[PDB]
Design a protein around this ligand. Structure first.
Ligand SMILES: C[C@@H](c1cccc2c(-c3ccc(NS(C)(=O)=O)c(F)c3)c(C(=O)O)[nH]c12)N1C[C@]2(C[C@@H](CN)C2)OC1=O
Ligand SMILES: [Zn+2]
Ligand SMILES: [Zn+2]
Length: 232
C-alpha cells in the first residue's frame, strides 16, 4: 500500500514494482537460498517507448513473473537487460529473458564468472568497464565499475535524468547490521570502491541497494562501515 515492498511481504514467486522517480522503478522479489528467504532488488528504466532492465528477479520463475508484472503495470516492452554481477540474484532468469526476446548484457568479467560457476550467462559483452573508475553509457543509464566490493565484477548504474544511483550488491541498506553474503567479496578493497562511487556520483538523490530499502547517499558510508566492521 505504498511502502517499499519487504521480504515477509512478498511470497517467493511474486514480483512487485516500486516507482522511484519519473521513468524509474525498482523491482522486488523474494527467493530461498540455503534454507533462508531473502528479498532482492533490480531496476527498470524507461528508454523511450521501450524499457531497460537492470538485473533479473533471482530465478527463472521470478523473472517470468517480473516480465508479467511489467506488462501489467507499465505495458512497454523490455528490450535490453544488464546484469550487474555474476550471482544468481543478478543473472538467474537470463535464460527466461533471452527466450522472451530481451537482449542480455554483462561485462566480460561477469560473463566469465557466471560461466565458470554454472550460472546463467548474458549474451553480450560490455566492454569499456574493465578498470575501476570506468564508465560507459547504455541507453538512459551510465554503467560504472567502482572496483571490487561485494564481488570483483560488480557494476553500479546511474540514471542521470533522475539522479538515481543503483548500487547493486556493492551497496547495503541502512538497517543492515552485517555485510550480507560476502562469499565472493573483497572486504579490503570494498571501502575504496565505495569511495569511488561517492566521488563519482555526489548528486545522487536516491540510492538503491541490491537488497533492502532505498535511501539517500548515507547508504554509501553505511556500507563502508558495515564492511569494515565485518572485516575487523
Ligand atoms: C545469490 C547470492 C545471495 C544468496 C543469499 C543471500 C544473499 C545476500 C544477502 C544476505 C543478507 C543481507 N542482509 S544483511 C546486509 O546481512 O543485513 C543482504 F542484504 C544480502 C546477498 C548480498 O549480500 O548481495 N547475496 C546473497 N549469493 C550466493 C553466493 C554464495 C556464493 C556461492 N558459494 C554465491 O554469494 C552471493 O552473494
Ligand atoms: Zn552477489
Ligand atoms: Zn546480492
Amino acid at each position: 500500500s505504498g511502502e517499499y515492498p519487504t521480504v515477509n511481504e512478498i511470497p517467493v514467486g511474486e514480483v512487485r514494482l516500486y516507482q522511484i522517480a519519473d521513468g524509474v522503478w525498482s523491482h522486488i522479489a523474494t527467493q530461498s537460498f540455503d534454507g533462508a528467504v531473502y528479498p532482492s532488488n533490480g531496476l527498470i528504466v524507461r528508454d523511450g517507448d521501450e524499457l531497460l532492465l537492470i538485473d533479473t528477479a533471482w530465478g527463472a520463475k521470478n523473472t517470468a513473473a517480473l516480465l508479467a508484472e511489467i506488462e501489467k503495470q507499465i505495458g512497454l516492452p523490455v528490450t535490453r537487460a544488464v546484469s550487474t554481477h555474476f550471482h544468481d540474484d543478478r543473472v538467474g532468469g537470463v535464460d527466461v529473458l533471452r527466450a522472451a526476446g530481451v537482449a542480455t548484457y554483462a561485462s566480460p568479467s561477469t560473463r566469465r564468472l557466471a560461466e565458470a560457476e554454472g550460472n546463467e550467462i548474458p549474451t553480450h559483452s560490455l566492454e569499456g568497464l574493465s578498470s575501476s573508475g570506468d564508465a560507459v553509457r547504455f541507453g538512459p543509464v551510465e554503467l560504472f565499475y567502482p572496483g571490487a566490493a561485494h564481488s570483483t565484477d560488480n557494476l553500479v548504474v546511474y540514471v542521470p535524468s533522475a539522479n538515481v544511483l543503483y548500487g547493486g550488491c556493492a551497496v547495503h541498506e541502512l538497517s543492515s547490521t552485517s555485510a550480507g553474503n560476502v562469499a565472493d567479496a573483497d572486504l579490503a578493497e570494498w571501502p575504496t570502491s565505495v569511495e569511488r562511487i561517492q566521488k563519482h556520483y555526489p548528486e545522487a538523490e536516491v540510492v538503491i541497494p541490491g537488497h533492502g530499502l532505498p535511501g539517500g547517499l548515507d547508504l554509501l558510508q553505511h556500507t563502508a562501515n558495515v564492511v569494515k566492521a565485518h572485516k575487523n
